[PDB]
Point group: D2
Chain length 510, copies 4
């Protein structure tokens, strides 16, 4: 019995990974293909939301750094106009003992209190000496931290912060993922800065970045998707997958529709995929994986951007005076992430949690703060108090004065927020993924393949691109299996226009 | 003024690298292409000669170990029959002080004289203690050797042997090339074997290998070339490139024929290429490279295979009692590498150099020995004596009895034999290659790109495949730039039939 | 009330330590002095017993190596005749798995079975690598052993043997005592000998030694004692100390005699001394010390010296097939340690424990074996079976054939045999000794000061000499407080005739 | 032919070493002895001079830290009255870049400029990392310095200062001598101090010291000499040795007197001694030694003690703005080192070298500065200028205002000042000293035995004491051969009243 639809390559999910697949499928223009998503708006976790008050919020505050020229190509194609983008410098700090320590923390001990400087420089001297002699490798994230930074910085920042964000102890995570995530501090340079009182916040791929002028980051993915042939997309309730029959290569949609595929690129969470397959073995396997949920909190506030806030981009909060691990001055990325000054809005509450002296709609201007709070079986959070707790936290960290007027609030919980690089992860993935591929199913993405090291938007996008390129041109999936390889190089070879398309164009013009 | 011929991609050279380009160009079947070679017979350095007496000789005794499924696919296509191949186990030894030390030498100290064992175990102990503390990297091949094996093994085997093959002292070479070439010995394992008297000759990719039943390895490349559209090839005097005009992208052949190209894949020696471009800058750059010439000496001998020879495949000769660094019992690979026993041949001489007691043509059977002797500006060789010196060497090493009857002899000198991994190499290549690429010229191959670590038949074949794959599909050239990456994995993704071809075939079906 | 006798310096005990004290007191001939001992025969633990059958036995088999010229002087004086001494070369072995391994064990791995050689060479490699990097110090004897020899040699010899002798686990002992006792094996030299099959039994002060022709080592001390003025000695029941009144410096003897002293040199076991002082605090401190008792077993056997025995001097037994840790072929030291061949003796029993076939007194010649067995609260021994058990052990270790005729037997238990270098030792001694000295009591000797590293006869002799030299001439007690100092040098300065006596002699000549 | 005088032991030189010998010869009161010196006043280099203006100057500013109770006893005997001594605390600083860095320099990096702190903390970090792994020993003082402090502190202080004092480059000196002279800095402690801004100037034996109320240190040795039997001393021109006839053990004095000896304790510089012996071999040997001369400069200045000067005791000057390596505020040690306030003196010059506005004799009070300048074949110094140069330096280092009134000046050059611990030293001494002893000559003292490690007054005194003790009581000369042993312990055994004298006294009481 024939399926309602038959394609060579079926793409499930229209987030960055899925759209990457679609883009390369569309570029090659060889096999037939189709992309579906239960959401009417493509973008997935890289989408932007809006409060009724006109405040925009990305899903946690997303800053792009591109490792791939291909990813750049597709962005330039979607938002080609110069004024589609703003370019910014990374102003990042960590909140430690009343003071803002420039990112990364481990490289800026100099901004700490004297007593704390001691504990830190001590830990590093120890670690540098043991390292001069070490011949074994760190078994856990935690060991790596101690080995690389010493007990001083471990206890002061690394350990408490990482629990606050991963929702699992540092001793429960693996060490291989953090090539380009965590900076290994040089003893000599660190003490030199302590002596001099200088800073060093240039480490990391976040140096300088682009942000879309309108629509938040979610705008990019809407623009990218628009380059696809509408009839090959199926977004909304009509595109919600409810069943995957690996054995006879057919997917079933919510509305009963059936799609037949030769090859399946799934970008939904691999545990949901296992469920949708009714494959008991895979379900059990995926159940060995671990993830944290993410609460994204949005706070719209009236007033000119306080000088105390300055041009800070994102801030890290290791201390326990606030529930959130990171905050972003989202209003700094684009003036279109919040209403214009002329827009009149009533004050909902003051930062201290009290009623405003006036509930009349007043003018702005406005600024915006975006928060993230992790959740897991090891770190539960109370949904009905988290917004209030977050706002208090903003007070406690002197992000807001208790008098500051709050004009808009945003709170949304994303079940699958972070794929946790646990000690167990690979043992599971090295079974799950191979077994899926033996069924002609490329499971890829932040939760498709579950590898955070390679879980950024560009990474995800390329996972989709490279899956297709593997399916069609026999390309090695570098991003999936070799995070350090792709992350350590400039990937310039693959382009939105490869030789193939050039030669075909010229043969058609004769 | 139009050229006689115009193709999208022109391939110069039909050795493995060139043919690799061809097979993928021919597979993709997109851009137009053409392949030329000055030799009527494709195969390059991987081809086979035959003496008038019917004894075959490869260019030094070639053994195939594949790192790529794609390579395997093309061999299977060209020689699909089970009985087209022989599969063998590596029986390799090193000749040291009257005894046969199993390969690798450094892993079998137990087979040496007691006095020599001491010198070696001592060396390793020292090295192992300094390694426990070392934090810098070796600057030369020689340092690497000392660090990894100790002075004992360095002076006994490594140092003398490597000069005898590379034709340059170990102190003039770089350390980066030897990932899978030189075995780093483990002190405990080595001494445990010395105590017990056990061996360990399983290290290396050569464990089990296959070899063509007929025509030598050259038979493979003739077969592979036959799967190409004949009309797209131009082999022989008609295909000899004499001039390359990079500025207007046209090549000129010996017979005056002009060929225009959009992309050039050049597999000739990059120094010859620079010469053919009349590009002074590149000629100067290429002259900073270094290579050794290779003398291949063949000796056909009458008699049943001596038990003293046994099933030995190839043998290493570090000592100075013979000029050759290696010997291959070529007759062991295939019964068709030498005449049948029923064939009658006259004896040309005895191993000791004297005349045969009888110049009548007697029967066999026969066995065959193939020698290699290196030459360079640092190690000259006398061509008119080398054959004789080699035969004497065979006597001194007890490979031949002074009474053994020589039936056939072979000697040929190949100017460009080994691309020497000198210290200066990369300094030159990282200038030569990029500058060539800016002219849309992909120089690839054993001398096309000059990197030995990736200079085997499968490496070369792939260098060509990947050059095309980069030109057409924007694939990254992994084999060229990341030897250790391609050598350390199973490269299974690229196939002689990719999804592209499958999907196009099914689209033409309906 | 005046005491019966009053001397300036009183010496309790006429072992080597006491005799040393006396000899220098007598040389200086300044302060008045006196030496007492409960034994009619001076010598203490360095005395010799005789069986009724005419078989001599030292208290464990004593071999002199002199660190002091002073010690040499007194022996030359006591036994000045050339033929008073025999000179020997140390032939020492360790009984391991049916074989005799030359001393020291850790230096002769070559003589072990192959399977065991591997275990050992492995341990040493591990330890050599850890050592290359170690920066801390060993906390226990055990740790020291591992660090210096590896787990292989530790489990095979060091750990089992050291318990067998010290009667306490190697984990319970300190590491500082073994400067010149335990050899630290060099990895390269060891493996070099395993490869070649050579030996290395020259390590240690025991190389070549001299032994008294007559009266066992006990003869020496009788002779030394005879050079003292008889009226200044009091040996026997008349010289047994029963009370020490530190407060009014008066000693009381068994026969009621009281002796007044200004300075006391006590060479009795320091725990006995505290008891004799009725000093509760010191008693409590001394009880923190630990010692092992020694069983000395003597076996006289009929027959020419078996060739299997050869010229072996002393032998170490780490295995558990015999209760003794060491055996000495005491008959080898001097022909006068056992009866002449012409002497007729009845056989008491056979080595297998059976009755002899003849109980008539037959002739010799004879040889003699001396054994040692340790006892402690951690290692009890059954006195009534130990002799039989020892004789069986001599059979199991093939020291005796079950047929060998045993002519004489000897067994005596010395309560204070070895002062155990426990972890707790120095904590107690650094209180005990100074507190005793504050009372003008120099407690010195193998059990007077309780320090094994400095507990040989010469050491003890010199402890007494230096004690007196401190009392009279303000000399620093080097042997007591700096074992490594005196052991690591040639002590040539102090002589039996110092300038003092030379100048006095010359002033009396005028 | 008999000598005019005959003694058992003859002592040449009445500095601290000679007087040490005499004191013990006098205590023992056994052999006959006699001490001679070419100076009417005993003290040697530890004697005091006086300027006509009434200003005292030690030979460089001598500060006593006693390692020996014996030394203490003799000083208590010579100067028994409480008010014979002043007790002080070590206030010591190093002059670096306009600031006073508390001694030791290496432990107080915090007091440096920020740019310099970096250079130093960097060097230590490097050093600490190499030390974690080092397994060889330093071949020179310089290497020791680098290894122990880093190139930072090496270039800033150690290297320049040590040449400025030793008159030789740090690379020309040996490493063994500096157990208690140079402090090995702990990285963690140093950086902790840099961070906190704290100090640490307690390291060293100089913590708290005592100084003779009257007569400078010279008063001590005058008082000590006075305790000797006058008739056994021969000081002055009458005591000047001119010949030493080692072969018939007779010494010849200036006035022709001949002294026969049995043992000779020579404290004159061993080079002069070899000369006096007319022993060619020893002359050659002694010429292999090296020494630096010492210029002592004394500056008396009118005025109350400037607050700028404070209670500083001695100060180190590594920088090249002054010729002197050390300065002492001698006036701070005792009020009797300079005239009383009431004394009237004319101003000789101003600190700037100009004439005084008034040559009338005005009152005080006064203060005194003592400087030291080194000289050698590698570092000449111009005698006629040095005084002025030194005064200028005092100006440059802001020790003196150019207006300060200089009342008195002192300058004297001591040919033998410092025995240089050169690399060659021991190779010479280990021949010189033993060869001398085979002749019954004990050469001892700062230049008698030439070892600086053990060349302070107490060390010297004891070298003499121990020499006599070796001659008479067969005592080991610990201070001569084991500097580290004596320096690292409290030497409490040898006293001015030993048991010997006590017992002899009580024997004569009966
Ligand atoms: Cl070529
Ligand atoms: Cl006792
Ligand atoms: Cl019998
Ligand atoms: Cl002198
Ligand atoms: Cl004036």
């Amino acid at each position: 019995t024939h399926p309602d639809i038959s394609v060579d390559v079926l793409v499930i999910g229209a987030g960055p990974t899925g759209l990457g697949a679609a883009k390369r499928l569309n570029q090659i223009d060889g096999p037939s293909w189709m992309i579906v998503d239960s959401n009417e708006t493509p973008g997935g976790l890289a989408s932007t939301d809006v409060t009724p008050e006109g405040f925009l919020y990305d899903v946690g505050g997303h800053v792009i750094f591109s490792h791939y020229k291909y990813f750049d190509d597709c962005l330039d194609e979607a938002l080609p106009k110069e004024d589609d983008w703003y370019t910014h410098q990374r102003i990042s700090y960590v909140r430690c003992q009343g003071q803002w320590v420039p990112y990364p923390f481990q490289n800026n001990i100099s901004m700490l209190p004297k007593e704390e400087q001691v504990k830190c420089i001590d830990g590093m001297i120890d670690a540098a000496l043991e390292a001069r002699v070490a011949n074994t490798k760190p078994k856990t994230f935690d060991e790596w931290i101690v080995r690389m930074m010493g007990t001083g910085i471990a206890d002061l920042f690394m350990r408490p912060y990482n629990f606050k964000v991963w929702a699992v102890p540092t001793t429960k995570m693996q060490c291989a993922w953090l090539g380009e995530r965590v900076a290994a501090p040089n003893l000599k340079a660190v003490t030199t800065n302590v002596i001099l009182g200088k800073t060093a916040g240039n480490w990391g791929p976040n140096a300088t970045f682009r942000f879309p002028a309108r629509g938040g980051t979610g705008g990019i993915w809407i623009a990218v998707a628009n380059t696809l042939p509408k009839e090959k997309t199926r977004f909304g309730e009509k595109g919600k997958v409810t069943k995957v029959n690996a054995n006879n290569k057919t997917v079933t949609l919510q509305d009963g529709t059936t799609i037949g595929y030769k090859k399946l690129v799934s970008t939904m969470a691999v545990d949901f995929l296992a469920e949708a397959m009714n494959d008991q073995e895979l379900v059990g396997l995926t159940k060995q994986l671990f993830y944290s949920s993410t609460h994204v909190i949005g706070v719209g506030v009236r007033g000119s951007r306080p000088e105390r806030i300055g041009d800070k981009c994102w801030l890290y909060f290791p201390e326990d005076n606030c529930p959130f691990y990171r905050a972003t001055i989202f209003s700094n990325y684009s003036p279109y992430n919040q209403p214009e000054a002329s827009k009149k809005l009533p004050t909902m509450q003051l930062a201290d949690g009290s009623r405003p002296q006036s509930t009349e709609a007043k003018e702005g201007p406005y600024w915006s703060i975006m928060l993230e709070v992790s959740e897991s079986s090891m770190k539960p959070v109370n949904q009905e108090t988290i917004l209030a707790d977050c706002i208090q936290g903003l007070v406690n960290t002197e992000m807001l004065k208790p008098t500051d007027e709050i004009v808009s609030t945003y709170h949304r919980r994303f079940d699958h927020g972070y794929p946790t690089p646990t000690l167990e992860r690979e043992g599971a993935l090295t079974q799950i993924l191979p077994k899926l591929q033996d069924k002609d199913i490329w499971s890829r993405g932040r939760f498709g393949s579950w590898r955070y090291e390679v879980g950024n938007q560009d990474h995800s996008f390329m996972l989709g691109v490279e899956a297709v390129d593997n399916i069609v041109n026999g390309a090695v999936e570098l991003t999936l299996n070799y995070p350090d390889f792709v992350n350590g190089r400039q990937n310039t070879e693959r382009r939105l226009v490869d030789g193939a398309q050039v030669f075909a164009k010229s043969k058609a013009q004769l």
